[PDB]
Amino acid sequence: MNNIHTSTHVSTYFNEALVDRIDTQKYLKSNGKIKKVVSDPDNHYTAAIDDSGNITVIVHKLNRFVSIKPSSPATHLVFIRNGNLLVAQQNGHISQYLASNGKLTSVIKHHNSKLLALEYNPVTKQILTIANDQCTLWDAQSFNKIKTLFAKASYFATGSLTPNGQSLITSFQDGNVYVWNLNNFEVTAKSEVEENMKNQKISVSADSSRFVIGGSTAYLYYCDISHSPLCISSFALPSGSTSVKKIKFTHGNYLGIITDNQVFYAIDSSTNQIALEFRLPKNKGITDFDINPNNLEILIVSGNGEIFKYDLQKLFIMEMNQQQRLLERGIESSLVYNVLKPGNQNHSLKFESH
Amino acid sequence: HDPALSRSFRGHEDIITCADFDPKMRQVASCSKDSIVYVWNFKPQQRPFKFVGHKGAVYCVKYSPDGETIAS
Numbered sequence: 001m002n003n004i005h006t007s008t009h010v011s012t013y014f015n016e017a018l019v020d021r022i023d024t025q026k027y028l029k030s031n032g033k034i035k036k037v038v039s040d041p042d043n044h045y046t047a048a049i050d051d052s053g054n055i056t057v058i059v060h061k062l063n064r065f066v067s068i069k070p071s072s073p074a075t076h077l078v079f080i081r082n083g084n085l086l087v088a089q090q091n092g093h094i095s096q097y098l099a100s101n102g103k104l105t106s107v108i109k110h111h112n113s114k115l116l117a118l119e120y121n122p123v124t125k126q127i128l129t130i131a132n133d134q135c136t137l138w139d140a141q142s143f144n145k146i147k148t149l150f151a152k153a154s155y156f157a158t159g160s161l162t163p164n165g166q167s168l169i170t171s172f173q174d175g176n177v178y179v180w181n182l183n184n185f186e187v188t189a190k191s192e193v194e195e196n197m198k199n200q201k202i203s204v205s206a207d208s209s210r211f212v213i214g215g216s217t218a219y220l221y222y223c224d225i226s227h228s229p230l231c232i233s234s235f236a237l238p239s240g241s242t243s244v245k246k247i248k249f250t251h252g253n254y255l256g257i258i259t260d261n262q263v264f265y266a267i268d269s270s271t272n273q274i275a276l277e278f279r280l281p282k283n284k285g286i287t288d289f290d291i292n293p294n295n296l297e298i299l300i301v302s303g304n305g306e307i308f309k310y311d312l313q314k315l316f317i318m319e320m321n322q323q324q325r326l327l328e329r330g331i332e333s334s335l336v337y338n339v340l341k342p343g344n345q346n347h348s349l350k351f352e353s354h
Numbered sequence: 355h356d357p358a359l360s361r362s363f364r365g366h367e368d369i370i371t372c373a374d375f376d377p378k379m380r381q382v383a384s385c386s387k388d389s390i391v392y393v394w395n396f397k398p399q400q401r402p403f404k405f406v407g408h409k410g411a412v413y414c415v416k417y418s419p420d421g422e423t424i425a426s
Contacts, residue, residue: 005419282418 007304009263009279013315014300014308020060024305027058027065033283037301038087040079041120041163043290045099046301049073057085057099058307060299068102070095076118078127080140086127088116094129096142106143110136117201121161124182128161128168130201135159135170137182149180157200157215164206169353171202177213177221177231179353189353191231194346195219203247203255206293210269212255213349214244220257220340221349222272230353233272233342237265251293254312258286266312273339276315280304361398372414376421383424385412391426 028034030052038047038055045066047057053071068087072095078086085099086108094108094116111131119128125140133156135149150156151172159170161182168180175197179189197215204211211223211230218241221234237259246258254275255267262285266276280286280302289300296312323333369387376383376393385391389409394402408426415426 007420281420 004279005281007281007284009277010281010302011304011306013278013318014302014306014310016310016318017314018309020063020309022058022060022305022307022309023063026063027056028305034287034301034303034305035285036073037288037290038074038077039288039290039299040077040099041122042079043292043297043299045077045079045085046290046299046307047074047077048287048301055087057102058301060307060309066099066102068097075116078118078120078140080120080125081122084142086118086120086140086142088118088129090114090116092116094118094142108136108138108142108145110145110148117158117160119160119163119204121163121166123164124161124166126161128159130156130158130160130170132156135168135180137161137168147185149185157197158202160202160204162204162206162208165208167204167208169202169204169208169211171197171200171213173198175200175213175215175221175349177202177349177351179230179351189230189351191229191349191351193349193351195221195234195349197349199243199245201246203249205249206251210249210253212247212257212267214247214257216243218242218244218259219347220244220247220267222269223351223353224269225353228352229350231349231351234348235272235340235343237340238274238277238338246288248289248291249293250291250296250312252296254296256289256291256312258288262286266316268337271334271339273334273337275333275337276312276319277338278315361396363392363394363402365402366392369411371412374414374416374424376417376424377419378421381421383415383417385415385426387411391415391424393424
């Protein structure tokens with residue numbers, strides 16, 4: 001007594017104004033549900049990983065899908081300018097197929113890890129993989145390597161590239177977060193931190209003035225390059241938070257956060273406040289999503305066999321309509337949101353970077 | 355404002371240990387102390403489904419919150 005169920009915070013908005021239908025029965029033949037979406041930086045191809053196999057790529061104009069026979073699920077997919085798809089498999093290998101045919105072109109291996117987190121930088125042609133104790137970085141063509149950047153001390157936790165700019169940010173098991181000179185194996189930017197975060201990814205804004213750090217602990221660390229240290233502040237999250245699995249960025253001030261309390265959050269960095277708070281069901285839970293950064297169009301695969309076709313601006317205006325009616329009455333959205341405030345220095349991930 | 359015993363689930367040969375609900379309002383789940391669980395709906399014309407398994411006692415049944423799988 002009395003927990004919060006079912007799909008009351010997800011399908012209830014996501015299906016609000018659809019212009020098409022996902023004929024779910026077309027895609028879900030498994031005794032099972034979609035657990036993750038691995039996806040296209042160009043958003044449209046949203047592949048569905050289930051608990052069965054044949055990872056598919058769902059194509060949302062055709063109401064058809066790409067069937068890529070092998071069962072091996074991805075940690076993430078990268079689709080690029082020329083029609084190719086790179087699949088970072090959970091099997092330790094990254095398999096590239098032509099996205100358009102599902103035809104294998106190459107496999108990248110170097111990683112010996114359960115995690116091969118991907119990020120793609122379309123302006124470097126570089127694909128980065130976060131795995132084991134390193135960052136393998138390579139030409140997006142994915143037939144060679146440029147180099148691997150390494151953590152030779154405490155265990156590597158994670159890292160990410162800047163997609164409409166150029167940098168690599170990585171971190172340690174001890175939360176130390178640092179920035180690399182992408183062409184010199186050089187860490188120019190270093191940190192010493194108190195929050196030790198396991199199971200983290202560092203999310204990078206496309207023009208990386210802004211960064212955020214997730215992890216095994218329920219705290220988020222925030223960066224702004226206009227100020228020193230790059231990581232300036234951090235703070236605790238609304239009650240019930242546990243750990244954070246993923247954060248993505250948009251062109252607005254926004255972080256899209258997947259928290260393992262099975263609630264999606266969206267945060268506005270100008271004060272670092274939570275605009276959106278939306279939960280998913282048991283099976284069929286938070287899966288993952290794609291974004292059009294300038295209207296925040298969302299291409300989310302919900303594990304329920306629904307793809308939305310909702311966006312953050314519509315979900316925001318829904319929340320902001322509540323507020324606009326009350327802005328007329330003086331409501332402060334920062335508190336409505338849960339704006340979180342900077343604390344002390346002894347639990348921070350403060351980081352200097354140039 | 356009545357405790358309202360309404361209409362019982364017929365059968366359930368002996369030995370009853372639990373019940374739960376499918377929030378369609380309602381498919382009722384229940385279970386016995388030997389080899390059987392049941393799931394059925396009212397609108398009494400509906401016939402219940404008798405599940406076979408749990409050759410030992412079934413202590414409790416609960417539905418997933420959406421009323422889909424019945425756990426036993």
